[PDB]
Design a protein around this nucleic acid. Sequence first.
DNA 1: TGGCCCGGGCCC
Length: 225
Amino acid sequence: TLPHGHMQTLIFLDLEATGLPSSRPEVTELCLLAVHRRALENTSISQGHPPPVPRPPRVVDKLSLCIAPGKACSPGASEITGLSKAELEVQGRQRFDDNLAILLRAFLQRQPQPCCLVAHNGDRYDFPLLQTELARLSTPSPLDGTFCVDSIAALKALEQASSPRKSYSLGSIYTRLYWQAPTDSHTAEGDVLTLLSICQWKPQALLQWVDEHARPFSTVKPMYG
DNA sequence: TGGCCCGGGCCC
Ligand SMILES: [Mg+2]
Ligand SMILES: [Mg+2]
């Protein structure tokens, strides 16, 4: 029933780009939360209604990077992300170069395999967008052995199983489960910490869903190119 | 830009 066995490391991912898929967007900010599967299943059972926001696991590897793009941000993008191509170049931020791929490669190697990526609406944005950026580089994709899932498809499965329309956006799910508001929205590290929290709602059930719906990242159709 | 889900908004 398990195609790739039990995922030993769940790396939560969020991307910030210059615009929408029609804009041919480029990654402006990148964040990764490497969390071991035991660090997740150590999270205590959610008690009371509403249940409190679960604290992040103590043993966690974190990587947040700001990347200067090649094209300017869209009016809507720079508005919500708080990022701009002009300011990034001003602060000497480097492009999405091969040196960044090497950084990602070493960061991923320090994590036990098999490893799975978790992104909100990643199957249709974050994973295809990241797939394109790595394709631009002559350096081989460091994710040829890495797997990935969508937390939107996950949360939809966990909500219908617990409670036999409904908004499944990152902001909506977080508030619906904890009766609170996400801190620092539309920031790479701000959304992953939010993503981790809505994933720590029912960890055992989450890990159970991930191992079944885990698919190779090398099968994700690129956004463009 | 491609799939969801009661063909037009979801979901940077
Ligand atoms: Mg996202
Ligand atoms: Mg985001």
